[PDB]
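Good morning N.,

You mentioned wanting to compare the apo and holo forms, so I went ahead and generated the holo version with A1IM9. This is what I fed in:
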Amino acid sequence: IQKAIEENNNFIKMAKEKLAQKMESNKENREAHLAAMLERLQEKDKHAEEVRKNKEL
Amino acid sequence: REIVHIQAGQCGNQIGAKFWEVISDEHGIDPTGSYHGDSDLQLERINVYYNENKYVPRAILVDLEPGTMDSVRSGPFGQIFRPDNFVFGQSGAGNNWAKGHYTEGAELVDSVLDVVRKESESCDCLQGFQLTHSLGGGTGSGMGTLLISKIREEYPDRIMNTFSVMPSPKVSDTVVEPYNATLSVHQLVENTDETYCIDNEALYDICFRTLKLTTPTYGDLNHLVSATMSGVTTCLRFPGQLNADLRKLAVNMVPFPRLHFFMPGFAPLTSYRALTVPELTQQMFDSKNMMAACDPRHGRYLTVAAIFRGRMSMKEVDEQMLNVQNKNSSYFVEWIPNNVKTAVCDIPPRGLKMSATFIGNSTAIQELFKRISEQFTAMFRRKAFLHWYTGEGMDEMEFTEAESNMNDLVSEYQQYQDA
Ligand SMILES: *[C@H]1CC(=O)C/C(C)=C\C=C\C(=O)O[C@H]([C@H](O)NC(=O)/C=C\C=C\C)C/C(C)=C/[C@@H]2CSC[C@H](C1)O2
Ligand SMILES: Nc1nc2c(ncn2[C@@H]2O[C@H](COP(=O)(O)OP(=O)(O)O)[C@@H](O)[C@H]2O)c(=O)[nH]1
Ligand SMILES: [Ca+2]
Ligand SMILES: [Mg+2]
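and this is what came out, ligand included:
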């Protein structure tokens, strides 16, 4: 009976932990995809600044 | 004097209910526990099975789900049982020996022992216990053998007797029956003094081939069983000389402690006509009237008890019983002299002027263990269906050990068959 309790508990534990690790990895990945996208868009705004500066000469 | 009766699980409660209906009728006890019979023979040994102007079965009803015990309570003699003697859980055992023996059964077993103790404690001189169960399910098999072990610990000098229904593929509920039966047989070998082996395949074939019932129900099978249980307990329950208590029966029937598995039989079994003592005797010894699906001509009798019931010539009984032994002497081991004993009770079963019941300790019972062993191995070699057991905490090694122990039993029977 102790063995059966232990293995049920260990199953819960491992399922809990695996899920926590996937939801964190997923979150960091999604965030990074978004941050990269926004950084490209910001490079473009900086480039448009330079164009308008280049025009002023 | 007193025997305490325990019935566990679906099969165990269903046959146990029928046993109590049948013996209550024989002892003149009505469904309200009142005595309305007309022979003092009925009451002389009533306290063996009944506490006392009412008579109440010394019976404990156990299960891990409520349904069969609800039917018992509603059934014919359902109000005769003491209400405190119904002990049941809710979760069930799922046809799983591990659930009965180790997990669910473990939660309920102490409450069963409380009731066992209360019944034992008002006994003037408890002789021991009789348990009805199947070996193929979860509760009767796993929890029933757990109970037997716990009773032995608390009453180690009392006799333990079982009526144990052995599974068959031909009359089967689940594929895991051979696992549950192998695990149980290992317990019975160590912890019972006497086990009546009742094969569901034998019951079916008797119903189908001999009784001409086209489609047998469990009800049909249990009718057979309850008739046989009545026959085999006759000498416990009525005045007499021979096998009159559980311990005397064991001393006469069990020459080696492990070889305590008996093949019972009943006669008559036919599809109004008078039966003769010759006919009873011949039918009682015929393989087709025996309830373990083993051919006694494939082995030898170590010991036999025969019980005749009804008005009949004691002289002709002794005569025919000597004819069978003298005519078939090779099937009786010669190194146990006078190994067949005969009792006679005047009271017949209901509906019959005359009957006979056979209890054989035959080396042919090896065939029943071998069959279960082969069905166990076919699955266990592929570890099939084991997850149901391992999920309750059991290890494979316990299955290996049960299989070995049952194969050992088979070898032990073979040795004495050859001796
Ligand atoms: C249970 C009986 C019941 O539900 C239905 C009826 C009406 C009868 C069943 C009879 C039966 O099974 O009988 C066998 C056997 O078939 N009978 C004979 O062979 C009779 C005469 C032979 C002459 C040559 C015997 C049997 C198992 C009877 C038991 C005794 S214990 C109580 C049950 C009642 O019947
Ligand atoms: N003879 C007979 N066999 C039964 C009966 N009910 C179940 N069985 C058999 O018993 C085994 C299943 O065990 P069961 O008693 O139903 O399970 P439990 O309730 O967990 O003990 C199988 O071998 C079935 O064929 C019954 O009323 N009579
Ligand atoms: Ca539980
Ligand atoms: Mg069942």
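Chain A has one helix and no strands.

Happy to go through it together on a call whenever suits you.

Best,
F.
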